[PDB]
Structure formats: structure tokens, C-alpha cells
Structure 1
Amino acid sequence: MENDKGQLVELYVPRKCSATNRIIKADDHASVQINVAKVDEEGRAIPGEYVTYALSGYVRSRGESDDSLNRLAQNDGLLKNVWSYSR
């Protein structure tokens, strides 16, 4: 949200649901940021190094948190089967 001559004005560009891409606004104290850890050669969870996803309170409210998580992780590479794009 720039300005006259470039210059980043207006603070705080918020987060965003990885499920719905709605804004995750401040008082949404019902949303969640899930850090899934990056692993290496034979177990070993590499501390501080995650694949992450953010899910709006609305989405978890509607129960769609566990299905939409599946889809995200799976098609990002950390599940295979579990989920099905069709029904």
C-alpha cells in the first residue's frame, strides 16, 4: 500500500489463511499458525526449520481445519494418499 513517491506507508500488512486467503486480523484469537518441521537423513527433525501454514479462525470453526490441512501438506509434499481431490 504505497504512496505518491514509492515509500511503504500504512503499517502491518497482515497474515493470510493458507486455506482461504482471507485476512487473519488481530482479534482473530481463534486462528492458528502450524509449524511442520523439516526432517533429514534418518529421522532427525532439524530444530528451527519448518514448512508452515496459517488457518483462519473461521476455517477451524467450521471444522474444515483437518481436511484443509491434509490437502495443503499433501500437495506440498508431506503426505501421499490420505487425501483425495475428488468425491
Structure 2
Amino acid sequence: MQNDAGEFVDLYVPRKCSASNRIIGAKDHASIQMNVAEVDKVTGRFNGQFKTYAICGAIRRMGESDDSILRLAKADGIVSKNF
């Protein structure tokens, strides 16, 4: 959060959800730092690239998050478009 003098006087910014664009509190323990890996284009082996996703707790406890993982992966390109 910016002031008029031009400093980041806010002490920290929290993470935002990647499925509903909601905020994650400091005491919401039902969040995930999801890590998915890619493969090489010529051999399908491990490379070292990550794509981090975050899911808030209400999306878990409300009933569906795997479909949101599919939409995130199709937007990223891991899951193919034909499905």
C-alpha cells in the first residue's frame, strides 16, 4: 500500500487465490502452495521449472477444487485442450 510520499509503508502483502481471486488470511491453514513440474520437449524428463498455484480454504471445504486445477492447467498448457 502506497502513501503520498512514495514508500511501501505496508509491512507485507498476502497471497491471492488463483481460482476465485480471493485473499488468504494468516490463520487460514487450509491453503496449498501447489507445485507442478514440466517435462522436456524432446525426452519428457525433469527440467526444474515450477508453476505455483494457490487455493483458498473455502474452495476445498465447499466441495470442488480439482476442476479449478483443470482450468488452471488448461490456461497454463499442461492439460491438453482436447481433454
- TM-score (structure 1 length as normaliser): 0.84
Runs of 4+ aligned structure 1 residues displaced above 6 Å come to none
Report what 1:85 is aligned to.
none
Report what 2:9 is aligned to.
9
Shift, 1:12, TM fit: 1.3
Alignment-mate amino acid for residue 3 of structure 1: N
Could you tell me which runs of 5 or more consecutive residues in structure 1 were left unpaired when the two chains were aligned. Answer: 83-87
| Helix, strand or coil at the partner of 2:8 | coil
Q: What is the RMSD computed on CA atoms of the aligned residues?
A: 1.2
Report what 1:28 is aligned to.
28
Alignment-mate amino acid for residue 55 of structure 1: I
Question: 2: distance between equivalents of 1:63 and 1:69?
Answer: 13
Question: Does the 8 Å contact 1:73/1:79 carry over to 2?
Answer: yes
Report what 1:43 is aligned to.
44
Alignment-mate amino acid for residue 39 of structure 2: V
Question: Does the 8 Å contact 1:31/1:58 carry over to 2?
Answer: no
| Count of aligned pairs between the two proteins | 81
Could you tell me which runs of 5 or more consecutive residues in structure 2 were left unpaired when the two chains were aligned. Answer: none
Q: Deviations over 1:19-44 (max 9, x none)?
A: 01111111110111111112213121
- Compare the two structures and name the one with the higher strand fraction: 2
Question: Does the 8 Å contact 2:38/2:78 carry over to 1?
Answer: no
- TM-score (structure 2 length as normaliser): 0.87
Report what 2:67 is aligned to.
67
